[PDB]
């Protein structure tokens, strides 16, 4: 259908890879919420984190998600803590149907908008995941190359 897709997990999921597959297997407009971050500011995603600091950059997530969100026929790669906010998580799961894609701390750390420069050490990824994951499985309706879990999803959701 012409319903939204929004994409939610931890950054290395795959949400803008698969989201863009997703969205040209069924002739729809596809977003990074990090991306139009970039649009709004001109500048790096983690460098706007960087000087606006946690409590900025979240607002103004937010906000460009409420946008987002509102739109319609949509694949939206959300970013990997956007899901911190209640409004946010309400909103997503409102709007559109909710893809969690699952992902392990290994894959997380593997190799290449970018949130941070570099990789943490596996403790900081296992720190989030313990915050995270019961948050993206809350607002979760479905749970998982980019092509063949396009299609996978494609399915799952017919």
Do not use: C
Not at 19 to 41: C, H, P, V, W
Request: glycine share 8%; aromatic share 6%; net charge negative.
């Amino acid at each position: 259908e012409k319903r939204n897709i929004f994409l939610v997990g931890p950054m290395g999921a795959g949400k803008s890879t698969i989201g863009r597959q997703l969205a040209q297997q069924l002739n729809m407009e596809f977003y990074d919420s990090d991306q139009e971050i970039e649009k709004r500011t001109g500048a790096d995603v983690g460098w706007v984190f960087d000087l606006e600091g946690e409590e900025g950059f979240r607002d103004r997530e937010e906000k460009v998600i409420n946008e987002l969100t509102e739109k319609q026929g949509i694949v939206l790669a959300t970013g990997g803590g956007s899901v911190k906010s209640r409004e946010t998580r309400n909103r997503l799961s409102a709007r559109g149907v909710v893809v969690y894609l699952e992902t392990t701390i290994e894959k997380q750390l593997a190799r290449t908008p970018l949130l941070h420069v570099e990789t943490p050490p596996r403790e900081v990824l296992e720190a989030l995941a313990n915050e995270r994951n019961p948050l993206y499985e809350e607002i979760a309706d479905v749970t998982i190359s980019a092509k063949v879990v396009a299609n996978q999803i494609i399915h799952m959701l017919e």
